[PDB]
């Protein structure tokens, strides 16, 4: 997207979200990142939402195909096709974070956001891998993100909370550590609860929304 203005890429990404054209949205935000300037809070969310939708559809298709595969060579071949496509999207996101979003991210808000993304897309890679190094790459990204968020953000910060939510899902679904997942979700929920009294009504709504996701998982896991 080298010939389009940065601002035009951002505006078209917003249009593609409204039209549910998430591949277009991801392509627009990839071109925006490749302009070389750092991303604002809003632009980070556009980047995240775009690729989360694209890879989410790939993961959902991969699970359908893998389920049929478990239950000629066509099923395996086509699952391999979707798997390769998924890994390509994950590799593209990881490449944007490595070149050069993370190294230019100095504020805690931006750095935790990019490191949480990095943990997520190694996690998605780990879901289809057949593997230990990919799992450890996810763990390492999540861990650095947690260490920063616990030093630099209040317990109710939505990025901190969503990071802990996904790290707990990593522990449960990927690392075969359900007890660590349950412990992380409960401690995150309890510290957030104790910090709600500091929030305005709108921040209270953001935080209690994600806290409920933590509770939903705990209800499922216990």
């Amino acid at each position: 997207m080298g010939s389009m203005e940065r601002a035009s890429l951002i505006q078209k990404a917003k249009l593609a979200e409204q039209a549910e054209r998430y591949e277009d949205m991801a392509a627009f935000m990839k071109g925006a990142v490749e302009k070389g300037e750092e991303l604002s809070c809003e632009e980070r969310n556009l980047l995240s939402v775009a690729y989360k939708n694209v890879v989410g559809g790939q993961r959902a298709a991969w699970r359908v195909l893998s389920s049929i595969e478990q239950k000629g060579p066509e099923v395996r071949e086509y699952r391999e096709k979707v798997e390769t496509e998924l890994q390509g999207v994950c590799d593209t996101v990881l490449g944007l974070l490595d070149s050069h979003l993370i190294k230019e991210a100095g504020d805690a808000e931006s750095r935790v956001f990019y490191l949480k993304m990095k943990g997520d897309y190694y996690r998605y890679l780990a879901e289809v891998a057949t593997k230990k190094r990919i799992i450890d790459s996810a763990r390492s990204a999540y861990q650095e993100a947690m260490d920063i968020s616990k030093k630099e953000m209040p317990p109710t910060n939505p990025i901190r909370l969503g990071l802990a939510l996904n790290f707990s899902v990593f522990h449960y679904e990927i690392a075969n550590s359900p007890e660590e997942a349950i412990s992380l979700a409960k401690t995150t929920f309890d510290e957030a609860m104790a910090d709600l009294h500091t929030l305005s009504e709108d921040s209270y709504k953001d935080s209690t929304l994600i806290m409920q996701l933590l509770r939903d998982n705990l209800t499922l896991w216990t």
Partner: peptide
């Protein structure tokens, strides 16, 4: 088990 919908 639900991650951030996002």
């Amino acid at each position: 088990a639900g991650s951030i919908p996002g």
